[PDB]
Amino acid sequence: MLVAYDSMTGNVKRFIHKLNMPAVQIDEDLVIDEDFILITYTTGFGNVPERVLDFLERNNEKLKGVSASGNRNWGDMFGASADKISTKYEVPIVSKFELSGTNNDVEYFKERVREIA
Numbered sequence: 748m749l750v751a752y753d754s755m756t757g758n759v760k761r762f763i764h765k766l767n768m769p770a771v772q773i774d775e776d777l778v779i780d781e782d783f784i785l786i787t788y789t790t791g792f793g794n795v796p797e798r799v800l801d802f803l804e805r806n807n808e809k810l811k812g813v814s815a816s817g818n819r820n821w822g823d824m825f826g827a828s829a830d831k832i833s834t835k836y837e838v839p840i841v842s843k844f845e846l847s848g849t850n851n852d853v854e855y856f857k858e859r860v861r862e863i864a
């Protein structure tokens with residue numbers, strides 16, 4: 748299962764390297780031609796980062812689920828980028844995790860993708 752991701756300060760990037768799954772960094776010409784899971788971080792007041800919004804405008808056809816990195820100090824805004832993407836594109840929230848994730852977060856992601864794929 749291909750994982751598409753973006754990371755500003757490296758936490759999501761660290762997480763996707765722990766997964767050892769096929770993974771691609773988002774950019775403005777990337778076109779994904781296969782089912783994929785998105786991993787995003789959360790920015791500002793519960794928001795999806797602009798680069799991720801731009802990518803999804805072009806590539807949502809094959810989106811099968813979303814995970815978010817965030818921080819529980821945001822309370823009910825924790826991982827709210829995933830809530831927004833799930834609600835809009837009608838795909839499941841695979842998982843939410845803090846920062847670069849724990850080993851349990853890594854294993855849970857993989858188990859959940861195996862269920863969804």
Ligand SMILES: Cc1cc2nc3c(=O)[nH]c(=O)nc-3n(C[C@H](O)[C@H](O)[C@H](O)COP(=O)(O)O)c2cc1C
Nearest residue numbers: 754755756757758759788789791793817818825826
């Ligand atoms: C300005 C600011 C706003 C943030 N907004 C949220 C938020 O609304 N919800 C959340 O769960 N985390 C929020 N975060 C936490 C980041 O999503 C978290 O640090 C994430 O691991 C960053 O991923 P990256 O290192 O891959 O860029 C915020 C962080 C910053 C610095």
Ligand SMILES: C[As](C)(=O)[O-]
Nearest residue numbers: 763764770771772
């Ligand atoms: C080439 As990579 C897995 O660091 O996005």
Ligand SMILES: [Zn+2]
Nearest residue numbers: 760763764770
């Ligand atoms: Zn790498």
Ligand SMILES: [Zn+2]
Nearest residue numbers: 797798800801
């Ligand atoms: Zn834009």
Ligand SMILES: [Zn+2]
Nearest residue numbers: 797800801804
């Ligand atoms: Zn736009």
Ligand SMILES: [Zn+2]
Nearest residue numbers: 821822823824
């Ligand atoms: Zn709130």
